[model samples]
Target: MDRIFMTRTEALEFLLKAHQTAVDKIGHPSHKQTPADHAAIEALDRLLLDVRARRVDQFQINASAAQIIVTD
Candidate 1:
Protein backbone atom coordinates (compact mmCIF):
# COMPACT_ATOMS: atom_id res chain seq x y z
CA MET A 1 0.00 0.00 0.00
CA ASP A 2 1.14 3.50 -0.77
CA ARG A 3 1.81 5.83 2.11
CA ILE A 4 0.54 9.38 2.34
CA PHE A 5 3.00 11.92 3.65
CA MET A 6 2.38 15.28 5.28
CA THR A 7 4.73 18.07 6.34
CA ARG A 8 4.79 19.51 9.84
CA THR A 9 2.58 22.49 9.00
CA GLU A 10 0.11 20.35 7.11
CA ALA A 11 -0.08 17.86 9.94
CA LEU A 12 -0.51 20.71 12.40
CA GLU A 13 -3.42 22.11 10.42
CA PHE A 14 -5.08 18.73 10.18
CA LEU A 15 -4.65 18.08 13.88
CA LEU A 16 -5.97 21.52 14.78
CA LYS A 17 -9.15 20.92 12.84
CA ALA A 18 -9.61 17.51 14.49
CA HIS A 19 -8.97 18.99 17.91
CA GLN A 20 -11.46 21.77 17.32
CA THR A 21 -14.10 19.27 16.26
CA ALA A 22 -13.49 17.22 19.37
CA VAL A 23 -13.67 20.29 21.55
CA ASP A 24 -16.91 21.40 19.97
CA LYS A 25 -18.52 18.04 20.47
CA ILE A 26 -17.28 17.72 24.02
CA GLY A 27 -18.32 21.23 24.86
CA HIS A 28 -21.88 20.64 23.71
CA PRO A 29 -24.28 20.99 26.67
CA SER A 30 -26.51 18.17 25.47
CA HIS A 31 -23.85 15.49 26.09
CA LYS A 32 -21.41 15.39 28.93
CA GLN A 33 -17.82 14.66 27.98
CA THR A 34 -16.44 11.42 29.34
CA PRO A 35 -12.97 10.74 30.72
CA ALA A 36 -12.03 8.95 27.52
CA ASP A 37 -13.10 11.95 25.48
CA HIS A 38 -10.94 14.22 27.59
CA ALA A 39 -8.00 11.89 27.21
CA ALA A 40 -8.35 11.78 23.46
CA ILE A 41 -8.41 15.54 23.22
CA GLU A 42 -5.42 15.77 25.52
CA ALA A 43 -3.43 13.45 23.30
CA LEU A 44 -4.26 15.57 20.30
CA ASP A 45 -3.17 18.67 22.19
CA ARG A 46 0.18 17.11 23.02
CA LEU A 47 0.75 16.14 19.41
CA LEU A 48 0.01 19.70 18.36
CA LEU A 49 2.56 20.97 20.83
CA ASP A 50 5.16 18.53 19.60
CA VAL A 51 4.65 19.68 16.04
CA ARG A 52 4.89 23.30 17.02
CA ALA A 53 8.07 22.65 18.98
CA ARG A 54 9.69 20.98 15.99
CA ARG A 55 9.93 17.68 17.81
CA VAL A 56 7.94 16.19 14.97
CA ASP A 57 8.14 17.18 11.32
CA GLN A 58 6.85 14.30 9.27
CA PHE A 59 3.68 12.20 9.22
CA GLN A 60 3.21 9.05 7.21
CA ILE A 61 -0.30 7.68 6.91
CA ASN A 62 -0.89 4.13 5.81
CA ALA A 63 -3.37 3.64 3.05
CA SER A 64 -4.50 0.14 4.05
CA ALA A 65 -3.73 0.06 7.74
CA ALA A 66 -4.89 1.81 10.86
CA GLN A 67 -1.60 3.47 11.74
CA ILE A 68 0.38 6.66 11.37
CA ILE A 69 4.17 6.98 11.41
CA VAL A 70 5.67 10.09 12.95
CA THR A 71 9.26 11.29 12.61
CA ASP A 72 11.45 14.31 13.16
Candidate 2:
Protein backbone atom coordinates (compact mmCIF):
# COMPACT_ATOMS: atom_id res chain seq x y z
CA MET A 1 0.00 0.00 0.00
CA ASP A 2 3.04 2.23 0.34
CA ARG A 3 4.03 1.73 -3.27
CA ILE A 4 4.05 4.49 -5.86
CA PHE A 5 2.77 2.99 -9.08
CA MET A 6 3.19 5.95 -11.45
CA THR A 7 5.70 8.51 -12.53
CA ARG A 8 5.09 12.21 -11.88
CA THR A 9 3.67 12.79 -15.33
CA GLU A 10 1.48 9.74 -15.06
CA ALA A 11 0.29 10.86 -11.67
CA LEU A 12 -0.59 14.24 -13.11
CA GLU A 13 -2.66 12.61 -15.81
CA PHE A 14 -4.38 10.47 -13.19
CA LEU A 15 -5.21 13.50 -11.10
CA LEU A 16 -6.39 15.48 -14.09
CA LYS A 17 -8.62 12.65 -15.20
CA ALA A 18 -10.24 12.44 -11.81
CA HIS A 19 -10.61 16.18 -11.70
CA GLN A 20 -12.22 16.24 -15.12
CA THR A 21 -14.62 13.47 -14.15
CA ALA A 22 -15.82 15.42 -11.16
CA VAL A 23 -16.13 18.57 -13.22
CA ASP A 24 -18.18 16.78 -15.84
CA LYS A 25 -20.43 15.31 -13.19
CA ILE A 26 -21.11 18.69 -11.63
CA GLY A 27 -21.43 20.49 -15.00
CA HIS A 28 -19.65 23.65 -13.93
CA PRO A 29 -16.26 25.20 -13.65
CA SER A 30 -14.64 24.58 -10.28
CA HIS A 31 -13.11 28.03 -10.15
CA LYS A 32 -11.69 30.83 -12.18
CA GLN A 33 -7.91 31.10 -11.99
CA THR A 34 -6.09 34.18 -10.81
CA PRO A 35 -3.63 36.04 -13.01
CA ALA A 36 -0.74 34.49 -11.07
CA ASP A 37 -2.16 30.96 -11.21
CA HIS A 38 -0.76 30.20 -7.77
CA ALA A 39 -3.19 27.40 -6.91
CA ALA A 40 -2.43 25.30 -9.97
CA ILE A 41 1.29 25.85 -9.64
CA GLU A 42 1.25 25.00 -5.94
CA ALA A 43 -0.80 21.87 -6.52
CA LEU A 44 1.67 20.67 -9.13
CA ASP A 45 4.56 21.30 -6.80
CA ARG A 46 2.86 19.47 -3.94
CA LEU A 47 2.01 16.48 -6.10
CA LEU A 48 5.60 16.28 -7.26
CA LEU A 49 6.77 16.28 -3.66
CA ASP A 50 4.55 13.30 -2.89
CA VAL A 51 5.71 11.56 -6.07
CA ARG A 52 9.38 12.01 -5.23
CA ALA A 53 8.82 10.70 -1.71
CA ARG A 54 8.26 7.28 -3.28
CA ARG A 55 11.48 7.36 -5.26
CA VAL A 56 13.44 5.59 -2.53
CA ASP A 57 11.03 2.69 -2.34
CA GLN A 58 10.75 2.50 -6.10
CA PHE A 59 14.50 2.43 -6.54
CA GLN A 60 14.86 -0.05 -3.71
CA ILE A 61 12.52 -2.45 -5.43
CA ASN A 62 14.22 -1.92 -8.75
CA ALA A 63 17.67 -2.52 -7.23
CA SER A 64 16.50 -5.87 -5.95
CA ALA A 65 16.29 -7.04 -9.59
CA ALA A 66 12.56 -6.64 -9.69
CA GLN A 67 10.78 -5.40 -12.80
CA ILE A 68 10.24 -1.69 -12.67
CA ILE A 69 6.97 -2.07 -14.52
CA VAL A 70 4.19 -4.19 -13.15
CA THR A 71 1.49 -6.13 -15.02
CA ASP A 72 -1.81 -7.73 -14.23
lDDT per residue (tens digit) for residues 1-72 in model 1: 644355666665556554455557678565666777666777667787777887874443335543334433
lDDT of prediction 2:
0.50
lDDT values of the candidates?
0.57, 0.50
Query: What tens-digit string does per-residue lDDT give for candidate 2 at 9-68?
Result: 465544455456556778976577667866667876765676566432233233333223
Off by over 4 Å in 1: 13-41, 57-63, 66-72
**C-alpha RMSD in Å of predicted model 1 compared with the true structure:** 6.8
